[PDB]
Amino acid sequence: NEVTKERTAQCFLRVDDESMQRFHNRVRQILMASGSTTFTKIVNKWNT
Amino acid sequence: SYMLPHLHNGWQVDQAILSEEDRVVVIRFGHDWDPTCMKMDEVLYSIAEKVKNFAVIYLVDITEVPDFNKMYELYDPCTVMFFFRNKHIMIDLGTGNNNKINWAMEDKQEMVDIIETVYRGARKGRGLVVSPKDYSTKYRY
RNA sequence: AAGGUAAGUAU
Numbered sequence: 001n002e003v004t005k006e007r008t009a010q011c012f013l014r015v016d017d018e019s020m021q022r023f024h025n026r027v028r029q030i031l032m033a034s035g036s037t038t039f040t041k042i043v044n045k046w047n048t
Numbered sequence: 049s050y051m052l053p054h055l056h057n058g059w060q061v062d063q064a065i066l067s068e069e070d071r072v073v074v075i076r077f078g079h080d081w082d083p084t085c086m087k088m089d090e091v092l093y094s095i096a097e098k099v100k101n102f103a104v105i106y107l108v109d110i111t112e113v114p115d116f117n118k119m120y121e122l123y124d125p126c127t128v129m130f131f132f133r134n135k136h137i138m139i140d141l142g143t144g145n146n147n148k149i150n151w152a153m154e155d156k157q158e159m160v161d162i163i164e165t166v167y168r169g170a171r172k173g174r175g176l177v178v179s180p181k182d183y184s185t186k187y188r189y
Numbered sequence: 190a191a192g193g194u195a196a197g198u199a200u
Contacts, residue, residue, distance in 0.1 A: 138194090138195095138196080140194090140195085142192070143192065144191060144192045144193080144194090145192095145194095146194065146195095147194095173196090174196060175195090175196035175197070176194090176195060176196050183192085184192050185192085
């Protein structure tokens, strides 16, 4: 609480399931386009 | 699947293999009624015009023409084999069987690349060529 | 159990 300079609540954060699915689909897309892709490019896409 | 030329006896297959001196003789061993053979024959039909400069495609029924079943181990629903100047050109597909393509492909460019690699290797005088793509896995994700 | 065959030419 800004006015009283005291804590009053707690936000419990959590990653949305839609973003989970987006990341999983990104990894699936990276893995699928890897027949001719080099190891360095795959790992770079993973890291990014 | 039905638009491709057909060979109706073993002598015709031998002559087709012998006749072509400058092109790869791609012969599919199977049955026009087998779904795997239908897929493979559709793929071969889609590329038949494209590769006509360096490849000729024939279809052989292994029941009508059983003269190569024991020889070439044609005991699979579909089988594609490559011959160049009366020599069977093996290909290292990574599947453990380097003599034939015993499954059905889905990409025209894949089959065209394999045909081109076989053509180049056989022109250089090689009995085994390495496929540009490995097939130890189906790349399914 | 496999996806791990060099393609040969000679004897």
